[PDB]
Amino acid sequence: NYEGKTKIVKVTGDYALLEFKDDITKHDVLTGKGSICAETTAILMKYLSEKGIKTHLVEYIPPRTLKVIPLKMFPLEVVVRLKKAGSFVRRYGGAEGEDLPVPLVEFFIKDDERHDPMVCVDHLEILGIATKKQAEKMKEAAVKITLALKEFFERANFELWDIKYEFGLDKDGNVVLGDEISPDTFRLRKKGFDKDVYRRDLGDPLKKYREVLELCRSLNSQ
Amino acid sequence: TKIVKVTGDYALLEFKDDLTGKGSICAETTAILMKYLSEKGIKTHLVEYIPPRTLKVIPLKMFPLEVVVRLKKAGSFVRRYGGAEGEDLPVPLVEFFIKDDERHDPMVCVDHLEILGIATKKQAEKMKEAAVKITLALKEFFERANFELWDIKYEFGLDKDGNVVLGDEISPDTFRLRKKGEIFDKDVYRRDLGDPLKKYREVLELCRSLNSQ
């Protein structure tokens, strides 16, 4: 099968199973965190799929398993930034939290060894990782999804700072959103304080996850 | 290094040995390659070489960018993505780097240059095309003497009219050049480790010779 850092994938016949673990990356292991991420992923991806966006989710199998369609994944991490934060401020400066004029899409070769080096489309073509067409699809999908998700959390007055995606090809060569969608892959903040936020997070990390889930459940029932 | 100093309608770019005596060689090399590039239709800030270390150049508003063109996988390219050192690239690869020492000159794709206010798609786009042309013409130039260009770095700026122009210099300080069929030797690096100007001298003489010296 295959055991990654936060989840394990097991190919079962036609479909595949994706089990979310309780690990963290301040590495550790919070209890019930896998179930939380599995469910918010399933809620978010369901919302996306009924909109036409292709994702690998077939269904949610409580508590921490997702029935997914196999995909031939790209060794890539596609990040969309709506606001300046993280490695973005450390590389180009700016005000963490400042809005960008438009959504920024960045590619990173997923390679924990040499760490995850950034790449531009030209790189993907030369390294034969993806074609100019696939790359451009992934970019279009990433932004589409990012905006759709942005409007989603918007209903709750929460703002999406940035989020990371991973895509793959299904049995027909379609670009499909794989991986997950949870606090582990995106930075979401209250509409318009560092100290405070940092406090509860250090108090008990599982709190932001619980809050995100409840939030998704809430918006999901409307 | 070297120091630029405007002289009214033009500028004077003085190459300093900054501790050696390479500035003269570097200026002459830059003048020879940059002059050959011009007849190839490429636009550079070169007006003329004023021996032994100055260049009469047209004033330019420089882009805070180091644009790299790789012909073969080497240096930072293999470290980042692996692959065999010296392996030729299907097509030249252009990479952009912001000049920010405090931030370690982060790489930036086109969408960055624009979103960051550094350049426009059209400018970035243009620096790419030029960089590839210059590189190919330079690779061709050295192949006539059995030398292979591995990678090189250029800097561009905008002239008073606003178009992309090649700036800075072209010398051993900006490109990696090896003779085809070179087998690295321990004793050679070592002993010759006392003559830093050696590579500069051979390059300059290489260019003079090719310049139909």
- Tokens read off for B62: 């420089």
Q: Does A104 touch chain B (CB under 8 A)?
A: yes
The C-alpha of B201 sits at a distance from chain A's nearest C-alpha, in angstroms, of 35
User: Looking at CA atoms only, how far is residue B80 from chain A in angstroms?
Assistant: 6
Q: How far is CA B9 from CA B6, B12, B30, B34, B38, in A?
A: 8, 10, 21, 20, 20
Cis peptide before A63 (omega within 30 of 0): yes
Residue B78 forms contact with A (CB below 8 Å) = no
Instruction: Name which of A105, A117, A126 is nearest B111 (Cβ-Cβ).
Output: A105
Give the closest residue to B127 by CA, choosing from B66, B59, B197.
B66
Cβ contact (<8 Å) for B93 and A123?
Answer: yes
What amino acid is encoded at B198 in this protein?
K
**Parallel, antiparallel or unpaired: strands A167-169 and A175-177:** antiparallel
Q: After which residues is chain B broken (C to N over 2.5 A)?
A: 18
Nearest to B80 among A91, A93, A117 (CB): A117
Confirm if B159 and B165 have CB atoms less than 8 A apart.
yes
Note the helical H segments in chain B.
22-39, 75-81, 110-115, 121-143, 186-191, 198-210
What CA–CA distance (Å, rounded) separates B58 from A127?
39
CB contact under 8 A, A120 and B95: yes
Q: Which residues contact B75 (CB under 8 A, 6 or more apart)?
A: B151, B176
Experimental determination approach used = X-ray
DSSP B18-43: ---SHHHHHHHHHHHHHHHHHHTT--
Place of tokens 């074609």: A131
Alpha carbons A99 and A160: distance in angstroms, whole number: 11
**Interchain contact B95–A (C-beta under 8 A):** yes
Please note each residue after which chain A is broken, C-to-N distance over 2.5 A, or write none.
25, 192
Domains of chain A: 1-71+205-222 (3.30.200.20), 72-204 (3.30.470.20)
* Facing A120 at nearest CB: one of B79, B89, B109: B109
Residue A46, classed as helix, strand or coil, is helix
Residues B66, B99 contacting (CB under 8 angstroms): yes
Cβ B39 vs Cβ B64: under 8 Å: no
DSSP-derived 3-state class of residue A58: strand
Q: Does residue B115 sit at the A interface (CB-CB below 8 Å)?
A: yes
Residue (of A185, A181, A207, A209) closest to A196 by Cα position: A207
Q: Count the Cβ atoms, other than its own, within 10 Å of residue B84.
A: 10
- Are B129 and B43 in contact by the 8 Å Cβ rule? The answer is no
Residues 6+ apart with CB under 8 A from A45: A55, A56, A57, A177, A181
Resolution in Å, one decimal, please: 2.2
Task: Using alpha carbons, select from B179, B175, B151, B148 the residue that is nearest to residue B33.
Answer: B175
Rounded distance, CA B53 to CA B73, Å?
Answer: 33
The answer to whether B111 faces chain A, any CB pair under 8 Å, is yes
CA-to-CA distance for A140 and A122, rounded, in angstroms? 17
Q: Rounded distance, CA B207 to CA B141, Å? A: 9
Residue type, A15: Y
Q: How far apart are CA A146 and CA A82, in angstroms?
A: 9
Cα gap A171→A169, rounded to integer Å: 7
In the Cβ-directed half-sphere of A120, how many Cα atoms lie within 13 Å? 14
Interface check B82 vs A, CB under 8 A: yes
Q: Position A108: which residue type?
A: F
Please state, in angstroms and rounded to a whole number, the distance separating the CA atoms of residues B119 and B117.
6
- How wide is the angle at C-alpha B157 spanned by C-alphas B151 and B163, nearest 5°? 110
Q: Give the count of beta carbons closer than 10 Å to the beta carbon of residue B57.
A: 25
Within chain A, where are the H helices?
33-49, 87-92, 121-126, 132-154, 194-203, 206-221
Q: How far apart are CA A71 and CA A174, in angstroms?
A: 9
Instruction: Chain A: give the shortest CA distance to residue B62, in Å.
Output: 18
How far is the C-alpha of B200 from the C-alpha of B172, rounded, in Å?
A: 6
User: Hey, what are A165's tokens?
Assistant: 């995606």
Question: Taking Cα atoms as reference points, which of B111, B98, B104 lies closest to residue B68?
Answer: B98
Contacts of B211 (CB under 8 A, 6+ apart): B32, B36
Through-space distance between the first and last CA atoms of chain B, rounded to whole angstroms: 27
Q: How far apart are the first and last CA of chain A?
A: 38
CA distance B169 to B54: 11
Nearest to A106 by CA among A77, A85, A129: A77
Measure Cα distances from B81 to A111, A113, A164 in Å. Answer: 9, 10, 20
